[PDB]
């Protein structure tokens, strides 16, 4: 991944760089084919090192001053030894080249006086870590290019040129998002290949975000209860950077009371096992420390602490991915391990669990070491000297945060480099607009002068901010004499430490910003695409996001005077839908009608089907032990007479 590093300028004295690139060999040529009026380079500087056992003494020695260890070897047989790096610099100046590009080449000849063009094994890049071109942060991109904007073009080799994507970045910041990958590393691909594509932008932060997903649970007498669980990463807008997920435990029967199923009394004790995976929804991988997690009952009753053995991960935990991989078994809290700590609950705790059917997983931000690029060997490797713990707070202090749920209504967080007005040193950080932030961090695009996220217009999402950011953005709107944020997205300026929360408008949200319902019109409309209906059930085509907010359905026969009979008349029997492989929903009438189709004794009778949303879900008998669906808030989504079915 190596060779030297060249700057090619159109002016005579190195002030207006037009191409920045790296050659694998001593062939420092740029062919005009890889380039407009600006293709005549009047100067050029190359930097790097050379490696080797011998004495040794380019194509334009009358235009080239050169040094090997600030020791001019051109403008002379010098000695060099096996296993040592000699710093190299070459400068070049021709006024008025008649040709475009540069056919330039550097050679040495040995002691068997045999010449050669310097192999790709004797040339190394400068150490671009945190006769001179101005590069204050030593990332490799000249200050002028960072500020004015540049693009990168891939021929064969990356070519960096003044403004494909228009980049800008800070000439004062090795990594403009204060993360562990440099601006130059990101845009030339000298970076860990597991970093998310959008975090190869210098203004989008690369960092892990980890939470724990519980898939299922099993409670038992210390007679058992096994249930599936749904977990969501949460957010409560806030300014906290903690990781947390909430688990909802299936309250519906999976075989013909939790307290009645388990013979608990008072002095009894219950044990808990579960299956989990770690989930990385950030933009950078983790390699050798999984974070530690408290499993919490109620507000702050820690039932367990979940840990994985440091330095013995069986893999990467990559962005947009799971550990273990989904193709592998999940992690058991007490694995098939003598000395797994038992997870225990007293009677009171057990009833509290049954009351709420909820747990919380609080995960710390301890992510361990970083795989950084090494310029000495052009490889990416875990760097024991580099730790995420030192990086995360710098990222958090210099970026605006956008949390967005456009992807399956799951909360996804990105951080974007943005100016801090009070910081005297960030006169140099690129201005970041809200609109550009959504495009680069989340992939919004604008086909027809309308900002969209995968088919959904931006106005289908609501904008919410923390208190400081609200005041800031309100002030901006008035300054713009704008009334409406959607119309001035391109002019809203983002600052460091802003928090912005963007949520699909069709839904209702709990205080964790999980989608837990939708207004009745939304719900009814999502159920109008009926494919088939019969006395055995309904086949519908229902939007994925809609299904996510539904806990179940209630089926009901209504006679001609409107007397109603609820077929699945228990709060724990609403789980009669399933999602077929063609993506359609089947609502099964037989499942709790003793496996029989409905019996409609009169064709004029109605079959009504109601959806129940998450937030309206009853998860226990009432105070007096009522287990019926009486009282449950439900939404009519199908109603037809016997003779229409
Ligand atoms: Ca730079
Ligand atoms: Ca920079």
Tab-separated table of C-alpha atoms in Angstrom, residues 238-241 393-402 415-423 426 429 465-470 472 494-500:
chain	number	residue	atom	x	y	z
A	238	UNK	CA	-30.971	14.009	25.564
A	239	UNK	CA	-27.251	14.755	25.806
A	240	UNK	CA	-26.179	11.375	27.277
A	241	UNK	CA	-23.867	8.928	25.488
A	393	UNK	CA	-14.984	12.069	24.438
A	394	UNK	CA	-13.133	14.067	21.747
A	395	UNK	CA	-15.612	12.820	19.152
A	396	UNK	CA	-18.523	13.701	21.486
A	397	UNK	CA	-17.213	17.238	22.135
A	398	UNK	CA	-16.595	18.229	18.501
A	399	UNK	CA	-19.575	16.796	16.633
A	400	UNK	CA	-23.321	17.331	16.414
A	401	UNK	CA	-25.316	14.186	17.032
A	402	UNK	CA	-28.199	13.078	14.877
A	415	UNK	CA	-22.032	12.185	14.656
A	416	UNK	CA	-20.973	14.847	12.200
A	417	UNK	CA	-18.031	17.252	12.451
A	418	UNK	CA	-19.343	20.756	13.121
A	419	UNK	CA	-17.941	24.084	14.307
A	420	UNK	CA	-17.756	25.109	17.937
A	421	UNK	CA	-18.278	28.902	17.775
A	422	UNK	CA	-16.346	29.601	21.018
A	423	UNK	CA	-13.284	27.548	20.031
A	426	UNK	CA	-12.032	26.107	14.600
A	429	UNK	CA	-13.642	23.696	10.488
A	465	UNK	CA	-33.710	18.901	19.774
A	466	UNK	CA	-32.334	19.260	23.307
A	467	UNK	CA	-33.012	22.609	25.023
A	468	UNK	CA	-29.777	24.358	24.022
A	469	UNK	CA	-30.046	23.199	20.401
A	470	UNK	CA	-33.755	24.233	20.171
A	472	UNK	CA	-30.053	27.823	18.789
A	494	UNK	CA	-24.912	22.602	12.779
A	495	UNK	CA	-22.614	23.241	15.785
A	496	UNK	CA	-20.645	20.847	18.030
A	497	UNK	CA	-22.611	19.374	20.941
A	498	UNK	CA	-26.007	19.743	19.244
A	499	UNK	CA	-28.389	16.838	19.661
A	500	UNK	CA	-31.027	16.251	17.011
